[PDB]
Amino acid sequence: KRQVASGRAYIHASYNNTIVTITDPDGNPITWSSGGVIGYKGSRKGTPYAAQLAALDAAKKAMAYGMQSVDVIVRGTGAGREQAIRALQASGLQVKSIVDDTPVPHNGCRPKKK
C-alpha cells in the first residue's frame, strides 16, 4: 500500500494492449502501467516494445515505494508476455518466481462470435 520491499507483479497481455500491476504480497496494488500509460495508442499498445517499457516503468515506480523483490504473475498471450517478464528481471527487480495463472474455463460461457 505504501512501503514494503517484497511484493508481486501482475502481467496482463491483451492483443491490443499490455498492463502490469505491482502489488504487496497480499494483493493490494502499489502502482501500475501499460502501453497507453507509456504513450502508445491502439495497435502499438500491443507491440512488444511497449510491453517492455510498461514493465520497466511499472518497475521504476515500485522501486520508489521500496520494492526490491517480486513474484511475477502472468495472464494473457499477447505479443509481450515474456517481454514484460524479460524487461522485469532486467530491471534490477528481484524476480523471485514467474508464474502462469491465465484463466481458462472448463467449458462454461459461450465466447463472442469468435
Binding site: 518466481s97 514467474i98 508464474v99 502462469d100 495463472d101 472448463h106
Partner: protein
C-alpha cells in the same frame, strides 16, 4: 521417457483415495495425463479418469495446478 504404468508397483485403480498413487498420473498441472504417456490401455485409462474425478470432488486431488516458473 518413462511410462506412468511401470513407474509404479501393483495397485488398484478404482481406489479414489490412494492419492499418492493417483497424484503421480495427474500431470504437472492437475490435467488428467494423456494415455499416450501414462502407458495405460483403453479400459484402464477410463476407470482411472473416473476415479480421479471422484477424488477431485472429495477434494483429495486438484482441478488445476498453476504452471510454475516459465
Amino acid at each position: 521417457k518413462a511410462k506412468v504404468k511401470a513407474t509404479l508397483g501393483e495397485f488398484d485403480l478404482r481406489d479414489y483415495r490412494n492419492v499418492e498413487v493417483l497424484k503421480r498420473f495427474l500431470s504437472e498441472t492437475g490435467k488428467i495425463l494423456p494415455r499416450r504417456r501414462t502407458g495405460l490401455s483403453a479400459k484402464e485409462q477410463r476407470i482411472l479418469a473416473k476415479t480421479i474425478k471422484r477424488a477431485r470432488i472429495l477434494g483429495l486431488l486438484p482441478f488445476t495446478e498453476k504452471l510454475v516458473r516459465k
